Symmetry: D2
Subunit: 324 residues, 4 copies
Amino acid sequence: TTRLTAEDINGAWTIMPTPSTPDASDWRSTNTVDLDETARIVEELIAAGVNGILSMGTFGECATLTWEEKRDYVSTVVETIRGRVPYFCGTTALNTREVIRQTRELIDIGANGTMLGVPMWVKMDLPTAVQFYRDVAGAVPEAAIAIYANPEAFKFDFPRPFWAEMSKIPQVVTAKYLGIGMLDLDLKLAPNIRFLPHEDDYYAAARINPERITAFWSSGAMCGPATAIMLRDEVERAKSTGDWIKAKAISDDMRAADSTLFPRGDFSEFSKYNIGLEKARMDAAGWLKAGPCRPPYNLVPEDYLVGAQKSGKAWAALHAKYSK
Amino acid sequence: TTRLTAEDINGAWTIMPTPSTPDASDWRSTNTVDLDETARIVEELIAAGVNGILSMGTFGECATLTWEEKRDYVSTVVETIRGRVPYFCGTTALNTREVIRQTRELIDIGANGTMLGVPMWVKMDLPTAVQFYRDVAGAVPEAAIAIYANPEAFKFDFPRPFWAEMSKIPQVVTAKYLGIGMLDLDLKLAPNIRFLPHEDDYYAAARINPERITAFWSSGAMCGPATAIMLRDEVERAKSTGDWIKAKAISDDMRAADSTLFPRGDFSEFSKYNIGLEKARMDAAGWLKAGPCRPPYNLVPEDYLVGAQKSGKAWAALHAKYSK
Amino acid sequence: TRLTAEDINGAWTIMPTPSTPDASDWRSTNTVDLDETARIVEELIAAGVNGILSMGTFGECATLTWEEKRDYVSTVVETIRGRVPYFCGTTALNTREVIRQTRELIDIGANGTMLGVPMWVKMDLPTAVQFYRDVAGAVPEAAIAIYANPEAFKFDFPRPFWAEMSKIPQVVTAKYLGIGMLDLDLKLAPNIRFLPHEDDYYAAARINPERITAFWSSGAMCGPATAIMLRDEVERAKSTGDWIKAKAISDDMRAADSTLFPRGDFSEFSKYNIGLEKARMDAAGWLKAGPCRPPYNLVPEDYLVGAQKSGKAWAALHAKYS
Amino acid sequence: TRLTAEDINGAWTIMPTPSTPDASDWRSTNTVDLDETARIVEELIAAGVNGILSMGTFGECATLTWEEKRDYVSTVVETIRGRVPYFCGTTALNTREVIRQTRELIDIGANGTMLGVPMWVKMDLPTAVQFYRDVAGAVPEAAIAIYANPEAFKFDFPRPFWAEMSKIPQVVTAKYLGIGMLDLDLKLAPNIRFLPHEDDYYAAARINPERITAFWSSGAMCGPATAIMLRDEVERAKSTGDWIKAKAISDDMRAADSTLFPRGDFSEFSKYNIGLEKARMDAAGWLKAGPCRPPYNLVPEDYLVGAQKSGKAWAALHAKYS
Ligand SMILES: *[C@@H](C[C@@H](O)c1ccccc1O)C(=O)O
Ligand SMILES: *[C@@H](C[C@@H](O)c1ccccc1O)C(=O)O
Ligand SMILES: *[C@@H](C[C@@H](O)c1ccccc1O)C(=O)O
Ligand SMILES: *[C@@H](C[C@@H](O)c1ccccc1O)C(=O)O
């Protein structure tokens, strides 16, 4: 096991949820992870051709799982993968010592890296955030680190000079990236990081810089991964042939499928219900069973739930359309 | 031990820090609590006449202590207090199950309640926040609960209908309250909660409603508690006599002493450095030894540090001025 | 002689700019109902108001034409007959326009201008201070009421701003919002009468009964008997030390306002500040505010309902306190 | 005949409103240096610009007097001689004023108005849509360029807004900021030429080289050779498929802008948008932007230094690419 670099990060990187038992919204329940569905999902993603698996971000419920639940979940993922694809766990926590303690334990179980935001009880500034990731990578230098650059969840907004500093840390190999307004500059400031746009932004981002932009992250794949596999294969054919017509059609399809996900189109309103909306979309699509949300985040306004289920139905149809 | 109500919450309620050892900014250190200073502070606050002790909020480093550190700190506080004043621990965490687990353990050690914000990885909405506090009070019904109504730390903004819902929960007995623009209405919506304004707002708040506003919280007391004791005694003399002149002079003194605390007067900018600024103020005042900040929050811009030290010097002088 | 803070007492009511029934049409040219203007002023004074402010946000200072403004003030100036003080409003997009407007309307017979700041570009503190010093120096016979609304004017009117405005003789008063820093601001600005919102006057008067002697009211456009009763009752409370009846009136006023703000949110209310106030007033039936001049004539129906319910509650209160 | 999106190509440069040396004084009355206006236009066209926008934020649409605006456009209209298209700017505080301004300046010989929305009260989506439909219907010979700046105009110009503007023939183009949703917006608004910022044109052209054929530039006021070279080089790149030299030019432009934003913060830059741009231009020495009309003549010195460093970098680039 030799540590991951940015060169090893290509293709469809799919973020899976942490499947929950039918009583997982109850604070009294203690072993709420469905390890059978957890295993089954891993088998079907790898069989579908995904290049790598991320986990334990916001909708993966890193916030609301217990430590014993996280260890059993990671263990099951690791066994089932059997080293066939790289795997990132997630270990964001409220302080640097807890982050380090979790990362050490989950790397030892067999995850290859951690998808990592920053502690967010106190809003972090730029030097605080740089030193945080430096401390972690120095404390566990065998862990690859994916920056989870979510300003809604983590308050800190991951600005341009932050990315210049992360490119200096060998462990930081990739980033779960949101809007691409400054992707052109961030690629220049951060040559050593594989920036993963969102799946819907992969088309545009790869056109900006087809040399650097070779991978993306997907949560839509939890509704049926054929669409993400099709987009990956068609973009890389497009880079060679110069014919982006079919790649644009898939990408436009993916955008339309997400058109009801965010309440009122509002990322901040979506962020209040990130966990529930992603899981309900996934529940609705029927490709896997995400299940109820662990507390406190088990209350979603019905109007918002409907938007997520419509998106989930739209992605299941896209999976059928782009299958075989 | 019969559970606290709002009627038992009067006077100067002082928030103490979690004293740290000289190497506490280092993530490698593991037992960073100075239990001797922890004990010494408790003895001197009780000797000074404080009516109650809060702890483990933002600057008390609930975010960055380890669990073994929190148990040793609470244990030491509890022993030293010897039931002479009520004590609130702090158990905010990222989910409801961890909050419950911590609260149970620290109540068993001997704290009388918990100062409790809300999980903040996902921004909470109003029903989510109400049900969170309901779940906790139902799971540990012997715990008194002080709402830590900090919208900067916890994203959720604790609006008026939230307070109407908390007044319905017997366990919720008090609140660490910030601006008083809507205190008049919140008192009406929440008859069963003792609202603690900030010490600098106690003068105005007690004039608004001297029947309901009988207590306040203080962090300035960690620079010398005579000023808070003097303000408490003089406001209650003012309520009876109707002569608020001396109470206004103390309160104006306290406001001027805080005039350099917030960088540029900005609560949000102060909130990025809440821990470091409070501790540096306390370090500067010399009444107790707060010490270095546990990681990641150990980096404060020097200009900001100077403002905090000036405030700390201003409060030490106020303590001398209002002593004996 | 120009107003000082010592002249600013009791209930100060903010007047809409009443509009003719074609006022939403951008083709319209003279959309002020000058007869309803005159009649509101007569009825306001008869009811015992202490002074009249106007031409702020819901007064449509932003959407009136210049000639419409000239005719409005003239109508108000001559209906008042010098019986109460009157502030017009002249907030515009730059200092020179603010000055040119303040000159003409003071000359027509306004006592002062209720004034926010140009807000195309958000000002910092020195920009705002200099702006107010510029206007005060340019029209020194005009009093100034700071219209301190950060939602409309972006700038948040912080503590050091109030200290500076106390340095300007012309700044006699301030239409003030949340009272969380009022105790401090009264200390920093000794020469300014701070007007809390009518619902906040009870608490503010109790904080500092010497300084807090006046408030501003828009609910009085629904029937001014409630605001007049709150002024008289608070004045009696400051002498008897018995605030029960003042708290009863104040708690009624909050209740009547409880459906005004869409979702309880001040910033969502600010998006429809014009429409919701005038729709509330129209539903109260004390006066006819009329359609909103373009572009702010579109308001969601759920929000409109909330303001009409509030108009009905204030109009009920006016009957309760007549 | 009125412009369509098919007429909007290449480098579109935004002109300051040059000011006489007394222009900061609120007592001043005619503060446009009409001879510098005329001379900038001559030099811009000679340099090969495709079209001229003006009178946005740093163009001081907010702080010019009406007569100053009339004389400015006349000077531009007659110096252009119909050689390139010209957009004036007529954003004001209400629809009727926006219309009255657009009529006169189009009549003087502007081809369109660069237009944001009234911003005393923040508009929602239907308010903004109706506002633009109102203006387009009221001056149909005028083209419209949406000036989509949420910092100045509060409203954030979301995706459903762009779909509506594509329904309006007059809306031919958009001065556009961050490009994170450009791919989607191009799909929702087929009839609008989207102008990215000059630094963003490289990436946007690569996303959609058929649609992204034009950009807006304020750095060209520091010396327009860099923007002209980026247009020609990007056009060659779309044919050769070789983007190395376009990326070199683009990366130079970002570097020259790297000290413009105080603390890298767009919202802090927006507080001094007028002053920082004109101070940058003054320091470049290609033209004389001049003092800022009140009230926006105060800028912190550290920020001023940052803009002057940027002016020097762009002026260096102009020499590099002449
Ligand atoms: C990461 C994914 C979320 O941050 C996100 C961001 C944007 C759109 C949709 C989603 O789910 C995670 O929750 O682990
Ligand atoms: C609570 C106190 C902070 O929330 C706070 C709020 C306002 C002014 C100063 C301080 O420290 C805590 O950190 O436990
Ligand atoms: C001032 C009054 C508004 O700013 C306001 C503020 C709070 C509640 C209600 C209203 O109308 C004005 O419109 O001139
Ligand atoms: C438009 C240009 C400004 O909105 C802007 C935006 C971003 C960077 C620089 C500038 O000037 C205008 O001022 O009319």
